[PDB]
Write a protein that holds these residues in place. Sequence first.
Motif, mmCIF file in Angstrom:
data_model
loop_
_atom_site.group_PDB
_atom_site.id
_atom_site.type_symbol
_atom_site.label_atom_id
_atom_site.label_comp_id
_atom_site.label_asym_id
_atom_site.label_seq_id
_atom_site.Cartn_x
_atom_site.Cartn_y
_atom_site.Cartn_z
ATOM 1 N N UNK A 133 -51.397 -47.980 -32.365
ATOM 2 C CA UNK A 133 -50.506 -48.416 -33.448
ATOM 3 C C UNK A 133 -50.335 -47.407 -34.572
ATOM 4 N N UNK A 134 -50.510 -46.136 -34.228
ATOM 5 C CA UNK A 134 -49.932 -45.057 -35.014
ATOM 6 C C UNK A 134 -48.419 -45.115 -34.847
ATOM 7 N N UNK A 135 -47.698 -44.683 -35.874
ATOM 8 C CA UNK A 135 -46.254 -44.530 -35.827
ATOM 9 C C UNK A 135 -45.863 -43.093 -36.203
ATOM 10 N N UNK A 136 -44.742 -42.618 -35.662
ATOM 11 C CA UNK A 136 -44.137 -41.356 -36.101
ATOM 12 C C UNK A 136 -43.503 -41.567 -37.468
ATOM 13 N N UNK A 137 -43.962 -40.836 -38.478
ATOM 14 C CA UNK A 137 -43.509 -41.059 -39.853
ATOM 15 C C UNK A 137 -42.900 -39.803 -40.433
ATOM 16 N N UNK A 138 -42.775 -38.775 -39.599
ATOM 17 C CA UNK A 138 -42.114 -37.533 -39.965
ATOM 18 C C UNK A 138 -42.096 -36.592 -38.767
ATOM 19 N N UNK A 139 -41.050 -35.787 -38.702
ATOM 20 C CA UNK A 139 -40.941 -34.713 -37.744
ATOM 21 C C UNK A 139 -41.080 -33.380 -38.491
ATOM 22 N N UNK A 140 -42.198 -32.674 -38.322
ATOM 23 C CA UNK A 140 -42.373 -31.370 -38.980
ATOM 24 C C UNK A 140 -41.697 -30.284 -38.161
ATOM 25 N N UNK A 141 -40.587 -29.766 -38.681
ATOM 26 C CA UNK A 141 -39.756 -28.841 -37.926
ATOM 27 C C UNK A 141 -40.412 -27.469 -37.870
ATOM 28 N N UNK A 142 -40.579 -26.934 -36.659
ATOM 29 C CA UNK A 142 -41.128 -25.599 -36.453
ATOM 30 C C UNK A 142 -42.507 -25.433 -37.047
ATOM 31 N N UNK A 143 -43.301 -26.479 -36.901
ATOM 32 C CA UNK A 143 -44.627 -26.540 -37.466
ATOM 33 C C UNK A 143 -45.622 -25.552 -36.846
ATOM 34 N N UNK A 144 -45.635 -25.449 -35.524
ATOM 35 C CA UNK A 144 -46.613 -24.574 -34.890
ATOM 36 C C UNK A 144 -46.111 -23.152 -34.918
ATOM 37 N N UNK A 145 -46.982 -22.220 -34.564
ATOM 38 C CA UNK A 145 -46.664 -20.803 -34.628
ATOM 39 C C UNK A 145 -45.529 -20.416 -33.673
ATOM 40 N N UNK A 146 -45.531 -20.947 -32.451
ATOM 41 C CA UNK A 146 -44.478 -20.613 -31.498
ATOM 42 C C UNK A 146 -43.138 -21.151 -31.965
ATOM 43 N N UNK A 147 -43.175 -22.181 -32.801
ATOM 44 C CA UNK A 147 -41.955 -22.757 -33.327
ATOM 45 C C UNK A 147 -41.790 -24.203 -32.925
#
Length: 158
Positions: A133-147
Motif C-alpha cells: 500500500x505504497x503509492x506513486x506520489x511523484x515521478x522524478x524525471x531523469x533521477x538516476x545517472x543513466x537518465x
Amino acid sequence: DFTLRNARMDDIDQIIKINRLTLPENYPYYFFVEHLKEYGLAFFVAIVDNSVVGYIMPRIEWGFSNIKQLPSLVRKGHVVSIAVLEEYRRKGIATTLLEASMKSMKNDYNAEEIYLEVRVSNYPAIALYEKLNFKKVKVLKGYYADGEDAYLMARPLH
Ligand SMILES: CC(C)(COP(=O)(O)OP(=O)(O)OC[C@H]1O[C@@H](n2cnc3c(N)ncnc32)[C@H](O)[C@@H]1OP(=O)(O)O)[C@@H](O)C(=O)NCCC(=O)NCCS
C-alpha cells in the motif's frame, strides 16, 4: 526457512557483497556502518543458513511531507536501500524486511510516513510496494545517472 534480526557490524561485509551483486548503487563501507548506528533499530537483515541474504537500510529524516493527508512538516522514514539475493527471492523476504523496518520507523523514531525511490522499470519492486500500500506520489524525471526516471513511492503510518 529464514530468520529476521537487526543488523550488526559483522554483517556489513555480507551486506556489502549483496549490495554489490544486486544493485548499481554501491556505497562505501562507512555508509552502512553510519546508518547502522544512527538508525539501527530499523536496519534489518534476512538470515538463511546463518548467512545474510537480504537487508534493508533506513534513514530517518525531518522535512516536507510526500503525502496529501499528512501535515506540512514531518518525521519520515527513508528506505535508502533494500536487496535480497536472487536465489532467495519470492520467498517473502523483502515484504518482511519492509514490515519490520516500518514498525520500527513508527514506534522507535516517530515516523509518520515511509518513502523510497524506485526505477520506473523495476516491475517486481513496484509490485512489492503497491502490495504493501505504497503509492506513486511523484515521478522524478531523469533521477538516476543513466537518465532513468524514478517513482518516489510513499505510505502513511496512521
Ligand atoms: C526482487 C525484489 C523486487 C523483491 O524481493 P522479494 O524477496 O522477492 O520480495 P517478496 O518475496 O516479499 O515478494 C512479495 C511481493 O513483491 C512482488 N514481487 C517480488 N518479486 C517479484 C517478481 N519476480 N516478479 C513480480 N513480482 C514480484 C510481488 O508482488 C510479491 O507478491 P506475491 O509474491 O504475493 O505475488 C527486490 O527486493 C530484490 O530482492 N532484488 C531486486 C533489487 C532491485 O532491483 N531493487 C531493490 C531496491 S529498489
